[PDB]
Amino acid sequence: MFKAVLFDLNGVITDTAEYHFRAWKALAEEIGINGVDRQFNEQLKGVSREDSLQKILDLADKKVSAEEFKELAKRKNDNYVKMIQDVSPADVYPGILQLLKDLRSNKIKIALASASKNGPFLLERMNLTGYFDAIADPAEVAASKPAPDIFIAAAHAVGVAPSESIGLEDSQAGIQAIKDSGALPIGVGRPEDLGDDIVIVPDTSHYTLEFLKEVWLQ
Ligand SMILES: O=P(O)(O)OC[C@H]1O[C@@H](OP(=O)(O)O)[C@H](O)[C@@H](O)[C@@H]1O
Ligand SMILES: [Mg+2]
């Protein structure tokens, strides 16, 4: 039996991707950079604040001091955080609270494995903090998804190996990170976007405890 689930935040528990996109878009327009469209923002998900900024600058080969790097990242995040102020336990995706409840009551460890440092804040606002045995700190990892570092760190934060764990994700990068940690990915979305070599569910209401047990088994 699997001993842990490792949850991505955005696109599994809820999704604030629209707000990250709007804030990043707004910042690029302010610094004169074209190309931050929705297509580009697909490669920004699963990706850290620092690495998302760098991808944006790289669009125009734009060079900045480390100080003006910090201020630009701070500008974007203040904007983003202003846009997620009304997030509540209404925003939690279908089946996720029940699954968290069923995982807890069966002694299955629950870890967050998000690239966002606003993760703690959102789980608080959604009243989900209590269910989480650990929240992997994206400040402390060496690389963004698809690197496996975040899911490895998450698994370790609940004293289990990734091989004892299930990873839940909406993104290609996230799924690839799960694969390379040694955890079992179960995706949510379309198999045209994520693949046909893994189990995909069409929405998060399909993420039930009995279904996870079935998949684990094969
Ligand atoms: O899918 P998840 O890993 O949960 O979220 C990924 C998001 O993390 C955010 O970090 P932040 O909140 O600015 O520190 C990034 O700025 C954003 O570009 C990215 O889409
Ligand atoms: Mg995600």
Swiss-Prot record:
Outcome of substituting S52A: Wild-type activity
- Give the free-text PTM comment from the record: Autophosphorylated.
Known SUPFAM superfamilies for this protein? HAD-like
EC numbers, comma separated: 5.4.2.6
Q: What induces it?
A: By maltose, trehalose and sucrose and repressed by glucose and lactose.
On pH dependence, the entry says: Optimum pH is around 7. Relatively stable in solution within the pH range of 5-9.5.
**CDD domains associated with the record:** HAD_BPGM (cd02598)
Family matches, as InterPro entries: B-phosphoglucomutase_hydrolase (IPR010976), Beta-PGM (IPR010972), Beta-PGM-like (IPR051600), HAD-like_sf (IPR036412), HAD-SF_hydro_IA (IPR006439), HAD_sf (IPR023214), PGP-like_dom2 (IPR023198)
User: Has UniProt tagged this entry with the keyword Magnesium?
Assistant: yes
Q: Name one GO cellular component term.
A: cytoplasm
| Disulfide-bonded cysteines | none
- Family, as annotated: Belongs to the HAD-like hydrolase superfamily. CbbY/CbbZ/Gph/YieH family.
Q: How does it assemble?
A: Monomer.
Q: Write the protein's name.
A: Beta-phosphoglucomutase
Q: Organism, per UniProt? A: Lactococcus lactis subsp. lactis (strain IL1403)
